[PDB]
Design a protein around this ligand. Structure first.
Ligand code: AKG
Ligand code: FE2
Length: 200
């Protein structure tokens, strides 16, 4: 896919049903919610987190917090299925010592999208991003270090795991508006799990 990046297609197929069961479990404690950007806009993607740290938005800036700002309780613990799959994927991608302390769970309803951005809220750039696709297919945009660099368009299907780090750790990327459809395991949406090492 790029220097330090790779797409392990269908890698998470065997663990998908369990992963989805655990997404529902996590959501039972920290419900999916559409966050508001520092600018004041409600995101189309609904999110929640599990693990020690969760990605959140603030009146002015993004940041990680061990506390869910909606429930005001800690985020749920990282499910075992999540931990195991992430580790295997990281190893297969060339990052054997990856130890995530945060997992951002994204839910894409039909038409939802995630505009081009960089995952630049994490201090340690040695840690890669492990991104798991579940359910409906989506078009993933993968660019470069500069906001205006050329973009590659890749279809991400159920079970696909994208991992980027090293030279591509800060590359711009996004998800185009989710096309309508149906999937046996997620029904009407696409879920994505983004594992990161947000702390030290
Ligand atoms: O849904 C995806 O495949 C991308 C999610 C993403 O870029 C993020 O959570 O930072
Ligand atoms: Fe991202």
């Amino acid at each position: 896919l790029a220097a330090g990046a790779v797409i392990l297609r269908r890698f998470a197929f065997n663990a998908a049903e369990q992963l989805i069961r655990d997404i529902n479990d996590v959501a039972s404690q920290s419900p999916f919610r559409q966050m508001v950007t520092p600018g004041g806009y409600t995101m189309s993607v609904a999110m929640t987190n599990c693990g020690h740290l969760g990605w959140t938005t603030h009146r002015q800036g993004y940041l990680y917090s061990p506390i869910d700002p909606q429930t005001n309780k800690p985020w749920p613990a990282m499910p075992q299925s999540f931990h195991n799959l992430c580790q295997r994927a990281a190893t297969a991608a060339g990052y054997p010592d990856f130890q995530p302390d945060a997992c951002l769970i994204n839910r894409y309803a039909p038409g939802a999208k995630l505009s081009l951005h960089q995952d630049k809220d994490e201090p340690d750039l040695r840690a890669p991003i492990v991104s798991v696709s579940l359910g409906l297919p989506a078009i993933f945009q993968f660019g470069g270090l500069k906001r205006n660099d050329p973009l590659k368009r890749l279809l991400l299907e159920h079970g696909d795991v994208v991992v980027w780090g090293g030279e591509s750790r800060l590359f711009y990327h996004g998800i185009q508006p989710l096309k309508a459809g149906f999937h046996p395991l997620t029904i009407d949406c696409r879920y994505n799990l983004t594992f990161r090492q947000a702390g030290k």
